[PDB]
Every structure is written in C-alpha cells, then in structure tokens.
Ligand code: HEM
Ligand code: HEM
Ligand SMILES: N=C(N)SCCc1cccc(CCSC(=N)N)c1
Ligand SMILES: N=C(N)SCCc1cccc(CCSC(=N)N)c1
C-alpha cells in the first residue's frame with residue numbers, strides 16, 4: 001500500500017496515512033534503534049545560543065521554504081510576487097546576512113507554528129490567533145507595556161482570546177530580547193529552612209532570581225511573581241504586574257462546602273513566555289503566546305503533581321478517604337473532585353476554560369480537518385492524552401505520528 | 417549515543433546503555449516517531465516455509481547461548497564451549513537446532529523481562545515454565561492448556577506461568593492457538609450490527625460457530641478454544657466450567673451495582689503472541705500472570721468499543737450525563753475500578769491496582785538500572801488508562817527498544 005506511516009484509530013477501526021511527515025525538514029530524537037519519544041527535552045530542537053551569524057547558505061534555504069509556504073497559503077505559488085519576494089530575501093541576506101518578514105508573513109508563520117505544535121491539544125483554534133507585531137520594541141520598559149497590553153486583550157475580563165506578541169528577532173552578534181519567567185503569570189516558590197517550599201516548587205529558581213534582582217519577596221502560597229524583562233545587551237530590569245491586570249479565580253467545590261476554605265486559587269491567563277518562535281530561519285527569542293486552560297492543567301498537574309502543590313493528600317483527608325491503602329483509590333477520588341472544582345470555579349467566575357472531554361473531542365475534529373488539508377497532523381501522544389481519565393477520552397485510541405514542522409515553537413536555553 | 421533519562425518528580429538522571437545491545441529495529445526514524453502505534457507495519461514474523469539463513473540464525477543462537485551461560489556464571493567454561501559446538505553442529509546439518517529445558521526456562525523469563533509494555537516485570541524472576549514441546553496433537557494442546565489453567569489459577573492465588581508448544585519448523589504449519597486469550601467472552605453480532613457480549617471478540621466468536629460451536633446468547637459466555645496442529649484444520653475444545661474461575665462484580669457501598677450483573681474472569685493469559693529465543697520461534701506459547709484492576713475496570717468494561725458500560729453506571733449513580741464538564745465519566749470510571757478491586761479481593765483472587773503496580777515497576781526500573789544499565793519501556797503502555805499523572809511512572813522518562821529473547825506479535829492463522 002502507501003509508503004507513508006499507517007495510522008489507526010482502534011475505537012472506530014478507521015485508517016489514515018500521514019503524508020505530511022515527509023515535509024519535516026528537521027530530525028527528532030528517535031532512531032530505528034530506540035524510541036526516545038517520552039523525553040520532555042531531547043537534545044534536538046533545543047535552540048542553543050548560536051552567537052556568530054548563521055551560514056547564509058542554510059538560512060537562505062530555510063527562508064526560501066517559508067516564503068514558499070506563504071505564497072502557497074495565499075494560492076499564488078509560482079507567481080511574480082512570489083519569485084520577487086524570493087529575490088528580495090536572497091538579496092537582503094546577501095548584503096546583511098539576515099532578512100526580515102512582511103507583516104502578513106509574520107501573522108501566517110505565527111499561526112503555522114501553533115498549527116505545527118505536536119504537544120498542543122487545542123489546535124482546532126489555530127486559525128483564530130491575534131498577532132501583535134512588536135518588532136519595533138527597543139526597551140525592556142517598552143516590553144512591559146506590550147505584555148501588559150497583551151494580558152489586557154487576552155484576558156478580556158474572562159472571555160479569553162488567544163494571542164501572541166512578537167518582539168525583535170535575534171540579530172547578528174547582538175543581545176536577544178528575552179523574558180526570564182517561563183510564563184507571564186507565575187506563583188512564587190519560597191525555599192524554606194526545613195528544606196520544603198512554600199508556593200509553587202516549579203518556580204523556585206525564577207523566584208530566587210527576582211530576589212537577586214531587587215524584588216521584595218512576600219511569603220504567601222500564591223504570590224504573583226514580577227517579570228524579568230531583558231532588552232538587547234542589557235541586564236534584566238524588573239517589573240511588577242498591576243494586580244488588576246492579573247485576573248485570578250478562587251476555587252470552590254459545587255457540593256463540598258469546605259473546599260472553598262482551602263484557599264486554593266489559580267490565574268486565568270496561561271501564557272508561555274520562554275519559548276522561541278522560529279520562522280523561515282529567523283529566530284524570535286521573546287514571543288509570548290497565550291490561550292485558555294484545559295481543566296486538567298490546573299486541577300491535575302499544577303495542583304496534584306508530587307513536585308507542585310501536591311494537594312492530593314490534604315484533599316483526600318478532608319473527604320475522609322482511606323489514604324493508608326492504594327486500593328481505596330483515594331488518589332483517583334480526590335483528583336476527580338479537585339478537577340470538578342476547577343471547572344466549577346471557572347464557569348462560576350465566567351472565565352474561559354475547557355474540560356479534557358470537550359477538548360480531546362475537538363482535537364479529534366482537528367485531526368480530521370488536518371487530514372484533508374495537509375495529509376496528516378504531527379502529534380505527541382503522551383501530551384495529547386489527558387493526565388486523568390486517559391482512555392475515557394477519544395485521543396487515547398487514536399494512533400499518532402510525531403515530527404517537526406516549521407514554523408515552530410522550540411525550547412531555548414535560559415538566558416542566565 | 418547513550419540517552420539521558422530523567423524523572424521529573426525527583427530530578428534524578430540515568431544513562432541507558434542497555435539499548436546498545438539492541439540488534440532489532442523499531443518503527444521510529446529521526447524523521448518521525450511512530451511509537452504510539454500498537455502493531456508493527458513490517459516488524460512482523462513472516463512465514464516459515466523455508467529455513468532461516470544459517471549464518472544469521474547461528475549468530476542469534478550463539479548470542480543467546482552466551483547469554484545463558486553468563487547467567488549461570490559459567491561463561492567460557494567447558495560446558496559453554498561444547499554447547500556452542502552442539503548448536504553449530506546441528507544448525508549446519510539441519511538448518512536449525514533445539515533448546516535444552518533449562519535454556520528454555522532462561523529464555524522465557526528473559527522474554528518477559530525484555531517486554532517493554534509490561535508493567536508487572538518486577539515478577540519476571542518468578543515464572544513457572546511448562547515444557548510442552550512434547551506435544552503432537554490439538555487434543556494434547558488442550559490437556560496441556562487445561563493444566564496451565566488449573567495451575568496458574570490455583571484456586572484464586574494466581575501464579576504466573578507459560579506453556580511452550582513446539583517451535584516453528586520450515587515448510588510446516590505452526591501449532592497455533594486461534595484465541596487471543598485462553599479465556600474470552602463471545603461477541604455476538606445481533607440486530608442492527610450492534611453487539612451482545614464482548615465486541616473485541618466478534619471475529620473469534622464467529623470462527624468458532626463456523627466450526628460447530630453452539631453459541632449462547634449472553635454477555636459473558638465463555639468461548640471455546642480453537643487449537644490447531646500443523647497443517648490441520650483447527651479443532652474445537654470446550655473448557656470445563658470448574659476450571660474457568662470468575663469474579664462477580666459488586667460495589668463496596670453502591671448496593672445496586674451487583675444488580676448490573678457484571679462479571680470477569682480471573683486468568684489473564686495471552687495465547688496468540690510468539691516467543692522468540694535464540695532465533696527459534698515458538699508460535700504457541702501461552703502465558704499468564706494476574707490482572708491489574710484497570711485492565712478490567714477501565715479498558716475492558718469502559719472502552720467505547722468494548723462493553724462500554726460507562727453511561728449505565730452514570731445513570732444509576734444518578735449523574736448529570738447531559739454535559740462533559742460534570743465529569744460524570746471520570747466519576748463512574750472510578751467506582752467501576754473500585755468495584756473490580758473490591759470484588760476480586762472479596763473473592764480472594766489475585767489482583768493489583770494501578771498505584772501499587774506502578775510503584776513496584778519504579779523499583780523494577782531501579783533494580784534493572786543497576787543490573788543491566790537500563791530497562792526498555794513503552795511509556796504509553798506503562799502509564800495506566802486513568803489517573804495517569806497520579807502514578808509515579810507518568811513522571812518518568814523511558815527508552816524503548818527491542819531485546820531478545822522477546823515476545824512478538826504474529827499474523828492471525830486464518
Ligand atoms: C486556545 C486554547 C488552548 C488550549 C486549551 C491549549 C492547551 C494546551 C495544553 C493542555 C498543552 C499541554 C500542557 C502541558 O502538558 O504542560 C499545550 C501545549 C502547547 N500549546 Fe496549546 N493550547 C491552547 C492555545 C495555545 C496557543 C494560542 C498556542 C500558540 C500560539 C499554543 C501552543 C502550544 C505549544 C507550543 C505547546 C507545547 C509547549 C511545550 O512543549 O511545553 N497553545 N496547549
Ligand atoms: C504478574 C502479573 C502481571 C501483570 C500485573 C502484568 C500486567 C500487564 C499489563 C497491564 C500490560 C498491558 C495490558 C494492556 O494494556 O493490554 C501487560 C502487557 C504485557 N505483559 Fe505483563 N503482566 C504480568 C505478567 C506477565 C507475564 C507472566 C508475562 C510473560 C511471561 C507478561 C508479558 C507481557 C507482554 C508481552 C505484554 C505486552 C503484550 C502486547 O503487546 O499486547 N506479563 N502486562
Ligand atoms: N496551556 C494552555 N491552555 S495555553 C498555551 C500556553 C501554555 C500555558 C501554560 C502551560 C503550557 C504547557 C508548557 S509550559 C512551558 N513550556 N513554560 C502552555
Ligand atoms: N495483562 C496481565 N495482567 S498478564 C499478561 C497477559 C495479558 C492479558 C490481557 C491483555 C494483555 C495485553 C494485550 S492482549 C494480546 N496481545 N492478545 C496481556
């Protein structure tokens with residue numbers, strides 16, 4: 001039959017062939033020998049700081065490819081505008097070593113990178129992304145204004161809108177525009193004397209970095225961290241987000257009246273800010289993007305992981321469950337309720353959020369659309385399937401082919 | 417070359433050097449990862465009408481024999497050397513060779529040990545091995561299979577076992593067990609293409625009827641075994657009801673649960689996989705251990721294409737099945753898994769929940785890291801179908817690759 005990967009859905013018995021994977025120009029971590037697919041950070045995409053300007057030869061072919069994708073998307077491949085834009089990039093790279101993107105080209109690549117993200121289950125919304133062009137930004141102070149504007153438009157008083165703000169691309173031998181915090185909104189992680197952590201253990205390093213930079217630390221379990229913004233060749237400046245801009249949601253349970261007394265809460269805007277956006281060779285080191293949460297992100301990973309808030313035991317104890325024996329499924333029960341609490345608290349506060357059932361179903365729809373439009377959809381199974389009730393959602397039964405397509409979002413080294 | 421493996425719950429890190437011993441290829445390539453695929457597109461076990469290339473078979477054998485002698489600390493010894501010459505001698509003259517019982521036993525245990533998808537490998541060292549290469553008829557396979565079942569079941573105190581029938585032979589049919597497990601409930605296609613019983617067993621159920629089985633009309637009708645001897649039409653054999661133990665499902669507090677009339681068998685025994693040791697292929701080598709609650713409560717009873725009883729329990733639990741956000745599905749799933757554990761514990765039948773199971777697997781990873789420098793594991797199969805991140809394995813990176821001896825998938829005999 002077809003000489004492309006055969007993909008099967010064991011629920012419906014249907015079959016497909018991903019032919020889009022042939023389009024992947026970049027290798028991943030696997031080899032016919034062993035599969036390193038479960039690795040979170042395989043040393044592959046990892047955009048390690050490559051100071052000295054890139055091989056004009058390599059950058060060019062990467063650029064020629066993107067421009068082709070662009071004209072193809074506007075249905076003018078082979079046209080005169082297409083060949084001229086091509087000559088325009090080659091010429092520019094010939095005389096300066098790099099090149100720049102047209103407004104509409106940036107919008108297209110930004111959406112494509114989201115569209116190409118293997119780990120994102122909410123890609124059915126890929127077509128609807130507000131792109132803020134901030135390639136004019138020239139100061140860490142200005143970066144803060146842009147971000148504040150982004151948070152304002154994205155939060156939109158609970159009726160969340162996906163968006164991304166693109167700052168100046170990396171320049172030959174010049175400093176990068178970086179955001180030190182992993183997310184625009186992060187709770188503090190206070191290292192205690194006994195060795196424990198107050199707040200979110202995930203953010204201990206960034207919290208300690210904000211202190212070494214002049215932040216006056218609080219002592220709560222949910223203190224919002226300040227942003228460490230870094231303009232080219234300058235030490236990072238520190239900014240404190242206006243509390244009114246950071247919308248949060250106190251958590252309560254629909255029937256367990258005591259849950260509200262736990263004082264648990266979560267912020268509404270999920271915005272990655274430390275990922276690198278790559279388009280046609282150009283690298284955008286600072287390009288924060290945001291959408292809206294899928295309840296399991298808050299209810300299962302952030303609130304229940306061993307290395308995060310780890311509230312499973314406390315909650316189970318309040319439910320009067322037998323936390324002394326694994327066979328009581330006390331973990332499963334408290335997890336369900338905690339997740340139900342996130343959903344209920346967000347809906348009540350009229351803030352955008354989607355549950356893992358609704359989410360995955362729509363991702364199935366996304367796969368069917370992409371199957372027709374591109375002949376496949378790159379997906380990372382372990383990331384698409386929810387952290388709870390896995391085989392209860394439809395993606396669990398859907399085989400998935402994983403691979404790297406550009407534009408793309410890549411991980412990048414911490415500036416420090 | 418050697419993959420850095422990290423656990424994101426502890427920050428610990430290890431290097432897998434065991435993958436270096438992989439002489440077989442997977443489906444993955446640097447271009448794209450096909451790891452979430454269940455079956456191999458090409459890594460199958462093609463027919464055996466001709467003899468395997470002696471040069472190759474010989475090298476798989478030499479290596480396995482090396483493996484066997486190293487295991488008993490008699491490497492390079494006299495026995496090791498004279499055993500290699502025996503195998504060289506036999507292969508050169510007949511194009512094949514045979515294994516000695518002890519070697520078989522070593523191989524069988526290694527195959528389990530190398531099983532990437534198995535979460536209960538901490539038990540790999542405790543396996544009762546029944547040598548059934550002394551078998552010559554389907555009627556003999558049946559007796560053999562009945563003993564395995566009697567032993568393995570052990571009145572509810574399950575013990576892990578495997579029974580090995582004759583290896584494959586060039587230009588000769590393979591001994592085969594048509595059924596995928598020694599115990600399966602029939603799947604009867606009724607009215608509107610819907611199904612009564614177990615949907616995954618529609619085909620096997622039909623093939624049985626086609627060979628003279630008097631079908632039933634229940635949701636849990638224990639199927640018969642279609643045993644097949646080389647180049648002979650398969651035969652039908654009914655299992656003695658007293659041999660097939662079963663657990664009726666009821667709930668700790670939900671009085672109405674038992675009313676649902678749900679039940680499941682005690683013995684999980686695969687019978688359609690192939691065991692490969694030192695190049696020799698065993699097409700009929702049924703094996704079993706004991707169920708992990710989630711296989712029953714989550715996959716078998718709740719999969720959409722299986723019994724799919726989720727909505728019923730939800731309605732009985734008087735839940736809001738109008739919307740997804742009420743998490744009525746996650747809620748029912750948990751009570752059903754709770755029921756399976758309760759019922760099995762009440763009937764005194766061996767069973768392990770997914771929390772206990774994954775904790776012990778973590779230990780196994782550790783025991784293996786020190787013992788061989790790594791442990792081949794398929795993440796998507798090790799992490800339970802529910803409460804994934806709630807278990808330790810979820811937060812553990814894993815490397816997957818093929819080691820031999822090994823259990824492999826093989827084409828259906830029909
Ligand atoms: C509209 C709602 C959206 C939802 C519900 C959604 C949900 C998710 C979830 C559940 C994850 C994985 C979380 C984890 O396991 O840590 C994820 C990852 C990701 N999403 Fe989305 N997403 C949405 C919007 C966005 C937007 C707007 C972009 C980009 C423009 C995007 C890009 C990505 C990328 C790159 C990843 C992987 C990041 C990594 O590797 O850590 N998502 N998304
Ligand atoms: C002691 C009890 C054992 C437990 C609790 C256990 C549990 C499991 C589980 C949960 C799976 C995945 C099942 C699925 O999702 O379909 C699995 C797969 C597997 N186990 Fe074990 N196992 C045990 C004993 C055995 C034994 C005795 C062998 C062989 C000697 C074995 C060989 C394998 C193999 C080959 C697979 C993968 C099969 C496939 O690819 O379909 N297991 N085991
Ligand atoms: N997850 C969403 N619902 S919207 C996309 C941004 C996002 C927000 C929060 C978490 C992660 C997952 C990766 S977290 C990281 N690489 N800093 C992504
Ligand atoms: N799973 C256990 N508790 S013991 C191993 C036997 C076993 C029983 C049930 C299911 C599967 C996995 C897929 S079954 C197959 N490849 N026909 C293996």
Ligand SMILES: [Zn+2]
Nearest residue numbers: 030035444449
């Ligand atoms: Zn892979």
